[PDB]
Write a protein that binds this ligand. Structure first.
Ligand SMILES: Nc1nc2ccc(OC(F)(F)F)cc2s1
Ligand SMILES: *[C@@H]1O[C@H](CO)[C@@H](O)[C@H](O)[C@H]1NC(C)=O
Length: 349
């Protein structure tokens, strides 16, 4: 179990002004620290955020958070469930800012909600330094879905923060799961505009080099992995289902069970091909040909394999690669088969 700590800096808040926080399970014998960013979509205007506050309030407020959370998947402390980092210090950072971890705006006379995701990450890091993070060798910033995009948006800022605080020995790395989206055409008209609106509403911030490339008004581009990733300095391992359910949802694709006809077949095959293409120059990546969403905190995350290598193994090979290609220890694992579940190890249900 990971135990809740609300932030001592109570100016760093969830959407409704309640304190943000983190769940922590320390491992005194380890210099590895895993900080996991929870996902859960986002909201981009008053009306949409008001609706989220009615029925997704734990994603907007700490008032009802439990005192503990069980660590699962990569956050598990059991080697059987987590062959990769079972002995690490484990941190789960609840997503309560609804801003894809990009916001830096407080609740105020003019703002019904606070959007402080980027500040939450930095405040968590600062408060952890006194609880052992100061002695870390590796800080792995991981996250799923909106948290995976949050990794891409924040990993270099965490690195810069620790450098400026005087901890140059801590190696900051990223693990972005299910946060690598395509700004593609929908299958039918009903994602780019939502982020453009959100950035303004949240006072959202993006990594500096990416911001300098795209410039004012175009920072929404930095929420798309294939555009922001090449600008990043920190090592980032990208985990992405080729047929991610959230991608298909934003693309207005709903697979019932009737025979898929040619237009949709071509659409789905093209989506997988495009995703594969965007990963070709990502040296640390795990991209199975499955219709699914998220993996790293699922208890059965050990089961999927690409080219016979599981994700925990690929992450271990990545660790080895960052010591100083490895025989039988691959780090770039992208399926080439073109249809969901052409990989036999894909999740079932
Ligand atoms: N460029 C984009 N980044 C994100 C991050 C999270 C998100 O919510 C979802 F549930 F789809 F993951 C959508 C998008 S679009
Ligand atoms: C608390 O957080 C705010 C917002 O990030 C920051 O401006 C302020 O310096 C912090 N105060 C302390 C004591 O850490």
């Amino acid at each position: 179990d990971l135990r809740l700590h609300l932030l001592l800096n109570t100016s760093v808040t969830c959407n409704d002004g309640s304190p943000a926080g983190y769940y922590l399970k320390e491992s005194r014998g380890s210099r590895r620290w895993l900080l996991f960013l929870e996902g859960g979509w986002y909201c981009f205007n008053r009306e949409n955020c008001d609706s989220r506050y009615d029925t997704m309030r734990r994603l907007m407020s700490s008032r009802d958070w439990p005192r503990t959370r069980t660590g699962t998947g990569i956050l598990s402390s059991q080697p059987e469930e987590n062959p990769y980092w079972w002995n690490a210090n484990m941190v789960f950072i609840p997503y309560c800012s609804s801003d894809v971890w990009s916001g830096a705006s407080s609740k105020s006379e003019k703002n019904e909600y606070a959007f402080m995701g980027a500040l939450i990450i930095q405040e968590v890091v600062r408060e952890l330094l006194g609880r052992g993070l100061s002695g870390a060798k590796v800080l792995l910033l991981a996250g799923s879905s909106a948290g995976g995009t949050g990794v891409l948006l924040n990993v270099d800022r965490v690195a810069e923060q620790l450098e400026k605080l005087g901890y140059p020995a801590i190696q900051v790395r990223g693990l972005a799961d299910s946060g690598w989206f395509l700004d593609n055409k929908q299958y039918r008209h009903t994602p780019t505009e939502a982020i453009r609106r959100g950035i303004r509403y949240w006072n959202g911030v993006v990594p500096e080099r990416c911001r300098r490339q795209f410039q004012e008004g175009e920072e929404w581009n930095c929420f798309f992995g294939y555009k922001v990733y090449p600008t990043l300095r920190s090592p980032v391992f990208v985990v992405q289902w080729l047929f991610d359910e959230a991608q298909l949802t934003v693309d207005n694709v709903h697979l019932t069970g009737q025979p898929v006809q040619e237009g949709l077949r071509l659409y789905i095959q093209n989506l997988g091909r495009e995703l594969r293409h965007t990963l070709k120059d990502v040296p640390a990546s795990f991209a199975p040909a499955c219709l699914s969403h998220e993996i790293i905190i699922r208890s059965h995350w050990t089961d999927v394999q690409v080219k016979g290598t599981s994700l925990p193994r690929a992450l271990h090979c990545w660790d080895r690669s960052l010591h100083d290609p490895l025989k039988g220890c691959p780090v770039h694992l992208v399926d080439s088969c073109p249809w969901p579940h052409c990989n036999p190890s894909c999740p079932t249900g």
